[PDB]
Design a protein around this ligand. Structure first.
Ligand SMILES: Nc1nc2c(ncn2[C@@H]2O[C@H](CO)[C@@H](O)[C@H]2OP(=O)(O)O)c(=O)[nH]1
Length: 104
């Protein structure tokens, strides 16, 4: 059930897969939504040890279960690459500044 824990947000594999599919599709069509223009390149400044190759893209995953459509993105993100492989699930919760910590 709780495959990914972001602070207090709990996401299942299906939740991630659904959000990732939506984000990858917009990337594929070259579209973006929200004040921060998601999905956009994630440079991995935090230096996370991803098992998949770059480039990476961040896309918001909502605790409500809805697919992001340009509103408030919240603190959690799913990270994917050009192969639509899941690099990881990250969050701003528990981090300082605009930094991310990996969800466990
Ligand atoms: N913290 C962080 N921000 C990133 C990274 N890659 C791109 N960014 C963007 O770099 C700027 C400083 O963090 C922000 O615009 C941020 O976008 P988001 O705010 O949409 O994450 C990354 O690897 N880590």
């Amino acid at each position: 059930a709780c495959d990914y824990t972001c602070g207090s947000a709990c996401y299942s594999s299906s939740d991630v897969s659904t959000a990732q599919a939506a984000g990858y599709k917009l990337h594929e069509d070259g579209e973006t939504v929200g004040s921060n223009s998601y999905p956009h390149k994630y440079n991995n400044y935090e230096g996370f040890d991803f098992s998949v190759s770059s480039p990476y893209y961040e896309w918001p995953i909502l605790s409500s279960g809805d697919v992001y459509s340009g509103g408030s993105p919240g603190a959690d993100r799913v990270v994917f690459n050009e192969n639509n492989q899941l690099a990881g699930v990250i969050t701003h919760a528990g981090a300082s500044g605009n930094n991310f910590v990996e969800c466990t």
